[PDB]
Each structure stands twice: as structure tokens, then as C-alpha cells.
Amino acid sequence: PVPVDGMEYHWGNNDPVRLWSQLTTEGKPHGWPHQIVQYYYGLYPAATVSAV
Amino acid sequence: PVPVDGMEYHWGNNDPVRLWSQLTTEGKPHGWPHQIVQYYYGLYPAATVSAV
Amino acid sequence: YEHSTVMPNVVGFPYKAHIERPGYSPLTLQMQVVETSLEPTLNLEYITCEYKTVVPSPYVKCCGASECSTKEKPDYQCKVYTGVYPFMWGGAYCFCDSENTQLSEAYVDRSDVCRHDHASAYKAHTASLKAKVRVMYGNVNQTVDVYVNGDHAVTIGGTQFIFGPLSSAWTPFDNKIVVYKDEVFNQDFPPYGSGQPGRFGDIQSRTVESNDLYANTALKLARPSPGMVHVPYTQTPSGFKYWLKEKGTALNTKAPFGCQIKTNPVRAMNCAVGNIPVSMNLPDSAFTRIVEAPTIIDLTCTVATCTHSSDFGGVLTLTYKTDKNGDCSVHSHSNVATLQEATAKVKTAGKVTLHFSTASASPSFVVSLCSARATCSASCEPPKDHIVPYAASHSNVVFPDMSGTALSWVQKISGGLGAFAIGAILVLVVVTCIGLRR
Amino acid sequence: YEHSTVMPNVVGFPYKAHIERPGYSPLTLQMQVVETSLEPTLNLEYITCEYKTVVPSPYVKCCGASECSTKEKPDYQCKVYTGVYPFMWGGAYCFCDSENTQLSEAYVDRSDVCRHDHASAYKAHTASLKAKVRVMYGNVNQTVDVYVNGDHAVTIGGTQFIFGPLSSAWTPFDNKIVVYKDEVFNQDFPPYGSGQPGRFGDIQSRTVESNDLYANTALKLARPSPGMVHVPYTQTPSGFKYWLKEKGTALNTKAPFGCQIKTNPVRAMNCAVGNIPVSMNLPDSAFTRIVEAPTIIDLTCTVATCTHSSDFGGVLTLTYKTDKNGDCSVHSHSNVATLQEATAKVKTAGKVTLHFSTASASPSFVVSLCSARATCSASCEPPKDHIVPYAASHSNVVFPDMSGTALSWVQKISGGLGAFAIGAILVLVVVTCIGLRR
Ligand SMILES: *[C@@H]1O[C@H](CO)[C@@H](O[C@@H]2O[C@H](CO)[C@@H](O[C@@H]3O[C@H](CO)[C@@H](O)[C@H](O)[C@@H]3O)[C@H](O)[C@H]2NC(C)=O)[C@H](O)[C@H]1NC(C)=O
Ligand SMILES: *[C@@H]1O[C@H](CO)[C@@H](O[C@@H]2O[C@H](CO)[C@@H](O[C@@H]3O[C@H](CO)[C@@H](O)[C@H](O)[C@@H]3O)[C@H](O)[C@H]2NC(C)=O)[C@H](O)[C@H]1NC(C)=O
Ligand SMILES: *[C@@H]1O[C@H](CO)[C@@H](O[C@@H]2O[C@H](CO)[C@@H](O[C@@H]3O[C@H](CO)[C@@H](O)[C@H](O)[C@@H]3O)[C@H](O)[C@H]2NC(C)=O)[C@H](O)[C@H]1NC(C)=O
Ligand SMILES: *[C@@H]1O[C@H](CO)[C@@H](O[C@@H]2O[C@H](CO)[C@@H](O[C@@H]3O[C@H](CO)[C@@H](O)[C@H](O)[C@@H]3O)[C@H](O)[C@H]2NC(C)=O)[C@H](O)[C@H]1NC(C)=O
């Protein structure tokens, strides 16, 4: 897992390498109200339902 | 002043000297009730009056 | 001129501060924390190394007897056996057939290489933080190393900087530490003088060169087998050696906040927590007089493209009108968006472009060039790349602006419902007022 | 056998412990705190010493002009003066009438005695105690060095002792400390790099040997008089030299609880406060067979004379009957009285004497000899001498016993009034019962 904070891995004898996730989703923002909810449900899918 | 805890005085190049005071007073314990008040007045002359 | 601000304790984050003197054109300073180090204070408790056992040659007193003598050595053991008739290659000496004596003697001592291979048991508290920071403004570069607490002032080309104490007091080191070579462990070690055999701390010494020693291995001597000379002994294996393979994990691969541990001296480098307050004192040479600064009028802002990715992914166009050609200081007064450059080269054509990074669907922020101001609002689509190998360069603010599409819809719906409710209240009030006036 | 107790942290106080194994005769062991030490943990901030001013000889160059060049020296000052017409012993050189020039140069540097004579500035925190205690019991008598924190166990004659963490966490040293020779001062110094002229810290260096130096003493050069070669300057006197005269007070003459201060290392000694827990683990050879110990029956205590002074000022006689002669481990189960010795040689005569010290006019305590018990009370008279040079040997408790004359008197008065009130209540209850029954 690689959350929006990031993670580092150390393979074999190399130097450790870091990876950061990026704010991506599957809804369509700035479209219909039934799509903006999907866009904001792809992100943080635990407060969006409560707010709606 | 030399309270019951004691104090040290250091004079010139001599070593400091420490002095302590004893629980002495002027009443008569184990006697008449008006003398026992004197005895417990010499010690702690601030709560004896309140207690009496 | 004095000033104060706060900057995040993130390595590589390009912090930009704005200075706005009443009698001069504004400045923009830039700071980057290129490295940190959080060093705790250490007290040595003891040093552990693999033991080694000394077995002096046996003393066979034959045609007589011998008696055990006690000494003062760590785990010293001495015993006497009776009735031995040892043999050697040439034959059997000690002509006396039965009444013989054999003396067995043993004790423990630190190894020969305890000076090069040992584990240190420390107790850590009251960490101190050290930083190295690049500061750049006007026309000066430079990186200085500063103690981050309210008591170190460094002068960088006539300006004085003081980095106040850190906001949070979190340190990844527990109250007790064990240090071995290049690894640090959060471990609870036995108290001095009470080590138990077979685990960490079977032998204990106050310092690598101290002569005293405390050892538990429970040596037990045994009666030598008939017709032989061997001094048989038994002893629990080496506690340090067992610890070496059963230590488990480390701190290097466990520390939170992603800061890496290093040894000699023990410290933890480059982890993000809290804010550094910074106080400044600038001389008058740095600023520029407003008569020299060009005057900017009728400044407005538009956005070409916006994609809220970690990199600098939004292009901004500012249009204006000026009288002379020069340089201005550009700033964005909100942390919802961060600008890439601090100074802009202003011409009479009336167009400049800037780059910004954000993380909100509908950013809204006020941007200033020299003395003017304007507001920018935009619509930003999410990116396509799932994973990027560089850290984020925005302040990570997600809540959209109130004029964006989403809150526009919310405002419209709430306005409709409120209109309906107020209309119902008015009708009811009129009817009740008629009823009361009847 | 495991045991625990608590011991006051007062030097010279002969604390006693009583241990009762159910199958063994009781034991009394004596502990005493001979010496203490309170090590604070220090990290050097900087060093200050009197500065020294170097002035290189003037460069009076004739028939032309000269230019000054900056240098990277602590508090450097260089200037050029025109129109100079110097003179020497034989005559006036620089043949040109007025096209001459002088270059004045000056800078400051740490004095050469700074390595021998200087003042250090520390930050102090997290004191650690250590102590040395003499223990004795039966035929054992020893003096040992122990750390007073819960992880140093020391073995004394087969017995394991652990002295726990101190009761309170009070320390005499403030957050910031200044050390000079053998005196310590609770002061606050300016931050490194921001010293001020004329006071403490006009020059600062990170360490005695460090190459860098920060000095700020307002060295100002002035043009030379007509017809002379002297390079005049004005420069504020030594801040360290001022401080050496106006430091004021100390800690050696101001520290509370009457504890000495010493330097190298910084420590505060014999500093009485709080309680020390003790955990003990004893072998089974320390006690004795109850069968082999004598039996005591019909134990009576009579006090001969009592006088509550600081010395051991009361005498007890214990009368008993025994079967066989031996040793008994006497103890007093209350802190109102403190006994002198811990053993008594019991003989068939059935008469033993003991000395004790108290601090109350009417003490009452239970004293035990071997396994027996007795309750013993006394009447004590005040002492005459107003002041003596030895510390208190009693526990300093003053509340008298319930059976004492004062409390018996108050008991009698209260009983009289209480019986009066009870009678009044009975009369009222009888009358009201009759009235209700009517
Ligand atoms: C040379 O060989 C002879 C062979 O016997 C050795 O004589 C033995 O010497 C030992 C030591 O004095 C004797 O032990 C003694 O035994 C008696 C009891 O009989 C005991 O009371 C003594 O305290 C002591 O332990 C041993 O008896 C004796 N052998 C005989 C047969 O009596 C001799 O010691 C050898 N000499 C050398 C230099 O090796
Ligand atoms: C202030 O000083 C620092 C360091 O002197 C400057 O950073 C340096 O910038 C140059 C070019 O801008 C870097 O050179 C190039 O770096 C890339 C990095 O990938 C390398 O691949 C190239 O081959 C080339 O060497 C240089 O490395 C870099 N130094 C450091 C330590 O980062 C900085 O630019 C100066 N300030 C300004 C405003 O330029
Ligand atoms: C011997 O004494 C004579 C005095 O006449 C020295 O002559 C001086 O030479 C210097 C050469 O640099 C002249 O300085 C120049 O003067 C001009 C005119 O003001 C000025 O523009 C230049 O910038 C430079 O300062 C100086 O005037 C001249 N003295 C005069 C003409 O009276 C000669 O140098 C001496 N010889 C030595 C010292 O070996
Ligand atoms: C337990 O052992 C310690 C030492 O191991 C004993 O300390 C002893 O203390 C006495 C007096 O407190 C010392 O005697 C003194 O000798 C000097 C010599 O000039 C004399 O001036 C004094 O008036 C006093 O007589 C004695 O030397 C010392 N023993 C030593 C240092 O070995 C302690 O007394 C022992 N406990 C008991 C109950 O005996």
C-alpha cells in the first residue's frame, strides 16, 4: 500500500526508494450533481457519504 | 536567626559552621492546665491560641 | 525592520514569505530546509560483549592432599576431587594408588575483542534539533546551519535570523536504547548487576576500559572421568551471541514519519513534524523605494489550464498596464495554491505568466504583483498518473471554494428551500394576524 | 526472602529496619546515608574570556592615495585618512606637502590566557542522584556506592539491595547556568551570536579550541592629530571583566536545603530532601532458628528518665524471664522514639537497659525484644540548652499520646459535657414521649 503520505522500500543491497501517491479518482468533477458525488467519493470514501 | 532547621555561617577563610536550635520553652508540661498552655505556647506560638 | 512567520518542517518544501513595508515596495524571501537532525542526549549505562572462559591447568597433588583456595574473580569456581589415578602417554604416574587429589579451577573474563565488537546500552532524553537551511532573496544565495531553538542568531548578509523552538516535542527514541554498530533498538535492558544467564547482558561492564566486571553464566565443574586429565566444565552459551540472532526488527526500518536513523553520534535525520517559527531583522538596504518601483494598474487574472497534481500544474496569465519596465515581487496570499517563482520581469506589453500548484477542485486565491491585487478562480481536473516518485509541492488543502460548481449547486438548492420556508411563515403569520385582529 | 521499606534522605540519620520471617527469629538491620551527590546533565553553550586588541603599525604612504580592503576578521575596522603630515624624531618625512595618506587598521581577538581563565555557559536539566550508604547487620558491616535510581543492584554479603528512585524531583540548578572556577550562578545569558557590548558575552566562542569567534565591542577609529603617528581608537571596556566584578551573589551561599555546591563536575552535595525506597532480597543464612533463639516471656518496660533533647535522652529498662542466654533484636515500632542499638545480650538476670531519643512530652510506643512485645509510655521534661551544634536524632514528631496528661485532661472535660448533653436529651425524650402518650 502507498497512501498519499508515501512509502519507502529497501530491496536487496541498493539504496531505499520512495514513492508517493497522487490525487486520482474515477468520478467526473464539475459535471452533474450525481457525478460530483462520485468524484468526491473516490477520494475519502468515508465522509462523503455522511455529508450527503 | 537559627530556626529548628538550623543555619550555617561562613566567616573569613575558616570552614563554615552550622548551628541548630532545640525545642526549648518556658512553660511547665505535665502540670497545671494554665502551665500546659504556656508550655505549648513557647513551641508554635501561632496555632496554640487558635486551638484553645 | 522586524518580522515573524512560521514555516513547515518539511525537507524540500519551497517556503515563500512576503514582507510589506509601508514606505517601500514589497519583498519575497524564499527558504528551504535542506537538512535536519534530531540528536538526543545520552548516558552510558553499560557495555556488553561475548565472554570467554579461562581454564587453568589442573593441579594433581598425589601422595598427599590439597585444599580449595578462594579468590576474587568473576564467577570464580574451585573444587577438589579425591581418588583420581590419572594416566599419561608414558604410563601412570602418582605411584600412590588411591589417595590422590585433583584441583579444578575456572572463571570468566571479557573477550579479547570486546573493544571492537560490543553493544552499548544507553538512556536517552531531552532531544536537541539542528538544521541546515537555504535562504534566498533579492540577489543573495547561501545555506547556513542553525540550532533550532530560540537562542542562535545567524547573520546572512546584514540580515539577522532566529529560528525559534520547534512546535512539537515528539522524539522517536524511547527512554532506553541499545546501540550496535549502525542500528538502534527500542529495548528494555536488565538493570546493572542483575543480568540473567543466557539473555542480553550475561556479562556487564561499566565502560570498555573499566577493570571491574559482573558475570552470570553459572559455571559448573564436574568430577573428571577415571584415568584422564581434562577438567570438565559446563556453562550456558553466550547471551550476547544469542541476542545477536534473536534481536528482532530495528528502528531503522520502523521509525515513524519517515526519518532515517544514523549512528556516531546517534541521530535521526529528515523527518517532518510541526512548524518552525522564524524571526527576522532586515536592514534598509534590501528594500526598494516605491518611487523606483513601477506602478501597476488594472490587474486581472485568468487561468489557462489547471490539473491538481503534485508538480506545478497550473498556468496563470496576469494582464495589467504600467508606465516603466522593471521587476516586481509576485505572491499568492493563500495556501490553497503555491507559486513557483517569486520575482517577475514586468514589461509594457501587459502580459505575464506564472505557474502554480494546488490540490483543490476549485481553487480561489488572491495574487499580488508589486502593489496591485486580483483574485483568481479556476476549475481543475484530476490527473491521470497514479504514482509519482517525487513528494507533493502543494499545501494539501482540499476544501473547494464557495463559488465553485459544487457549492453553487448547494447554494441554489438551499436558496430554494429557504424561499419555500419563508413563504410558508409569511402566510401563517398573515392568517394569525387576521385572526387576532378579528 | 523479599522485603521492602522506605528511608529518609537525611545524612547521618541511623535508619533501622525490622524483618519478621514466620519461621525465624526477627532481624534488625541498620542503614545510614554517608554521602550524596546530584549530577545535572550539561551541554556547553559557549565560553567567554577577556578580549585583546591588536593594532598593526600604521601605513603612512607618501605622495599618493591608498585604498582599504575588507578582511574576514572578528570586528574589523579599517579607514583611510588624507592630508596627514607626520613627524619623526629626526624630522618630518613624506616630502610632499599635503598629498599623503594614512591607513588605520584594527581588530579584536581572544586573549592568550583565555585557555586558563574563562567562564562557561551551560544549560542544565535532568539531574541524576548517586549516593554511598553503609549497611550493617549481624556480623556484616560495609560501605557501598550506589546509584539512586531503580536500576543498580549491589550485592552485600549474599544480600541484594536496590535503591529506588527519589521521592521528589527538586533540583537547585535553573534552566541556564554560568560556571566560573568553583562557583555556579543561576543566570540567563544572551544567545550565542547576539552578545552586547559592555556586558557578559561581548565575545563568544563555541569552545575553548574553536577557531571561529563572534565579538561585538564597538571599536571605532578616529583620525590622528596633526603631526603625529598614533592611530587613536575608542572601544568599550571588557564585558567579562565587568561581569567578574558585578556578578553578585552566588549559589554556594544561596542554595536551599543547606546543600554544598562543587564544580568539576558540577554537583550539589549532601542535599537533604525526600525519601528513598529500598528493595531487599536476603538469603536464608542471615536469620536464625527460632528454636535456637531464646524465648522471652513476661516482658515489662519501665522508663527511668526522659528529656526530649536532640541527643539520645531517655533510658528504658526491660524486665523479663528467659530460658537460655543469647542475642535479641530489639526494635521500636513507632517513629516517635528512636532507639540507640539494635541488639541486646539477654542474660538470666532478666534486666536490660536501652537508650532512646524522642521529641514529644508524652511518648508512647511498642517495643519488641526478640519475639516478645511490650507497650511503654513515658513523661518527658524540656531541655535547658538553647542551641547545640549537632543535628536532630529524632524523627521530629510532636503530637502527644492520647493517654498523656493534656489529652487525658481534655478527655475528662469532653466526657463531662457529653454526659451532660446525653442527660438533657434523655430528659427531653422522656417528656415528649409522655406528652405524645397523653
Ligand atoms: C614414594 O612412594 C611411596 C609409596 O608408598 C609413598 O609413600 C606414601 O606416602 C604418603 C604420603 O606421606 C602416605 O600417605 C599417608 O597415609 C597415612 C595412612 O597410612 C596417613 O595417615 C598420612 O596422613 C598420609 O596420608 C602413604 O601411606 C605412603 N605409602 C604407604 C604404602 O604407606 C611416598 O610418598 C612416595 N614419595 C614421593 C616423593 O613421591
Ligand atoms: C544557489 O546555489 C545552489 C547551489 O550552488 C544552486 O543549485 C544549483 O543549481 C544548478 C543549476 O541551477 C545545478 O546544476 C545542475 O544540476 C542538475 C541537477 O539535476 C544536474 O543534473 C546538472 O548536471 C547541473 O549540475 C546544481 O547542481 C545545483 N546545486 C545544488 C546543490 O542543488 C542554486 O541554483 C542557486 N540559486 C539560484 C537562484 O540559482
Ligand atoms: C620625490 O618627490 C617628488 C615630489 O615632487 C615626487 O613626485 C610625485 O610623484 C607622484 C607620482 O605618482 C605624483 O603623484 C601624482 O600626482 C598627480 C598630480 O596631482 C595625480 O594626478 C596623480 O594621481 C598622482 O597622485 C606627485 O604629484 C609628485 N609630486 C609633485 C609633482 O609635487 C616623487 O614621487 C618622489 N620620488 C620618490 C618618492 O621616489
Ligand atoms: C563498621 O566498619 C567501619 C569501617 O569499616 C567502622 O568505622 C570505624 O569508625 C570508628 C569511629 O567512627 C573509627 O575509629 C576512629 O579512629 C580515629 C583514628 O584517629 C579516632 O580519631 C576516632 O576517634 C575514632 O576512634 C574507625 O577507624 C573506623 N574503622 C575503620 C575506618 O576501619 C565502624 O565502626 C564499623 N561498625 C561498628 C559498629 O563498629
Numbering used by the authors:
A (entry chain B), B (entry chain K): 319 to 370
C (entry chain h), D (entry chain H): 1 to 438
Q: What does the literature reporting this entry say, word for word?
A:
Inspired by the structure of the in vivo mimic structure of LA-3-5 in complex with SFV, VLDLR LBD-SFV was also prepared at a ratio of 30:1. This structure was resolved to 8.8 Å (bin4) using icosahedral symmetry, and the twofold axis region was optimized with the same algorithm. After reconstruction of the particles at the twofold axis region, to avoid bias introduced by icosahedral symmetry, two rounds of 3D classifications were used to release the symmetry, and the asymmetric twofold axis region reconstruction at 3.7 Å resolution was produced. Distinct from LA3-5-SFV, VLDLR LBD-SFV displayed an asymmetric binding pattern, indicating a bona fide in vivo mimicry attachment. In the structure of VLDLR LBD-SFV, LA2, LA3, and LA5 bind to site-1, site-2, and site-1’, respectively, with a maximal interaction area between VLDLR LBD and SFV, facilitating viral attachment to host cells. In addition, the properties of single LA binding modes, including LA2 only binding to site-1 (or site-1’), and binding of LA5 in site-2 (or site-2’) needs adjacent binding sites to stay empty, were also confirmed in this binding mode. In the fivefold axis region, LAs still exhibit a spatially hindered unsaturated distribution. Furthermore, the multiple cryo-electron microscopy structures of VLDLR-SFV complexes and mutagenesis studies have demonstrated that under physiological conditions, VLDLR primarily binds to E1-DIII of site-1, site-2, and site-1’ at the twofold symmetry axes of SFV virion through LA2, LA3, and LA5, respectively.
